[PDB]
Amino acid sequence: DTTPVVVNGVVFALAYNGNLTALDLRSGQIMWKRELGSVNDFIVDGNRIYLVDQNDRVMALTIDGGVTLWTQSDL
Amino acid sequence: VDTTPVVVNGVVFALAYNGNLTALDLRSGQIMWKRELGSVNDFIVDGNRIYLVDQNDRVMALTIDGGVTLWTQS
Amino acid sequence: GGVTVSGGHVYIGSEKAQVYALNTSDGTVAWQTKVAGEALSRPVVSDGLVLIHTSNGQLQALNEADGAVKWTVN
Amino acid sequence: NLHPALADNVVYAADRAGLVKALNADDGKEIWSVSLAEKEPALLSGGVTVSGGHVYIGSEKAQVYALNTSDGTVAWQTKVAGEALSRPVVSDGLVLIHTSNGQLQALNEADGAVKWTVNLDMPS
Numbered sequence A: 001d002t003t004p005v006v007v008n009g010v011v012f013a014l015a016y017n018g019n020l021t022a023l024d025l026r027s028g029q030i031m032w033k034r035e036l037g038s039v040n041d042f043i044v045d046g047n048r049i050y051l052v053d054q055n056d057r058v059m060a061l062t063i064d065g066g067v068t069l070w071t072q073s074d075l
Numbered sequence B: 001v002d003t004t005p006v007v008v009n010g011v012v013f014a015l016a017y018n019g020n021l022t023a024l025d026l027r028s029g030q031i032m033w034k035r036e037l038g039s040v041n042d043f044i045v046d047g048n049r050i051y052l053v054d055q056n057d058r059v060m061a062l063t064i065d066g067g068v069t070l071w072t073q074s
Numbered sequence C: 001g002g003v004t005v006s007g008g009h010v011y012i013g014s015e016k017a018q019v020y021a022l023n024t025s026d027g028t029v030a031w032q033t034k035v036a037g038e039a040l041s042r043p044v045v046s047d048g049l050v051l052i053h054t055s056n057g058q059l060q061a062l063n064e065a066d067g068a069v070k071w072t073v074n
Numbered sequence D: 001n002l003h004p005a006l007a008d009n010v011v012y013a014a015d016r017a018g019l020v021k022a023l024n025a026d027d028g029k030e031i032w033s034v035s036l037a038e039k040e041p042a043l044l045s046g047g048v049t050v051s052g053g054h055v056y057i058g059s060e061k062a063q064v065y066a067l068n069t070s071d072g073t074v075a076w077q078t079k080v081a082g083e084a085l086s087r088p089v090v091s092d093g094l095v096l097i098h099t100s101n102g103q104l105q106a107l108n109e110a111d112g113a114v115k116w117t118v119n120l121d122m123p124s
């Protein structure tokens, strides 16, 4: 998932190395960054970002600080 | 070729690997129309039309409801 | 893979021909359905249905509430 | 060859060789047609994205083009950090480009100047 997504002045972008970054669209200043592993896809919805990796581990993070809300890995 | 389906007005559009396009009724899965024409690679939908592009960059406009070709340009 | 969100559910398809609905609140499994093949596209949600296009060339619609297969085509 | 776009009843379509065209959505008549070669192909890959009287297209030669919707002439052309394989995203007067070598760049819609560059790969 390499096309950047923009919601409310904030850019969410995924690097190949599983780095997920939230930036201010105007300045490019990083609001938050999470170092993850093997993230294949993500989506922004309401107050959360939902991610999954190749291991079918699914996470939710806050849209504000990229803070982990929950993790599901027993799929 | 993008394989993920698109839904517009209760109509599902799905492109297969071979460039075959299918339009199905969303509620029943009932096939409305199919075009096994060309190597279509991409499409975009608006109000009543779906626009297909092929490998040769040819563009065809079809109606969403009937799969009727309104025009083609190459 | 692929992940989408609708109606208090996170939907995810897997290579293992499984589709999961987790609750957006806590990530607990709402439901789990075996599909016709490798689910290698984002699930697409519309009108209470979760559409799954498989590498198998199948197109299935699963109920949003319980994950039951409403219809299967192709 | 690339992802086509639709804006104000005009279909904008491009191919890898560099052919970009704009067609009336009603009857398919060609409003304009233009080539971004060169002979030597332009290798268009990222696009097409339409916004602000501009058609934005990225290429494998690390270029981002802005064409005028009016006549298909090149409004601007910007050297980016790596191959522009994704669709440009437009927001708040900025064109966002994710390059194949992990850079995220925001370019001005008006003149294509890179306003900022972030290394997404960087360990942090």
Ligand code: NA
Binding pocket: A045, A046, A047, A048, C005, C024
């Ligand atoms: Na949500």
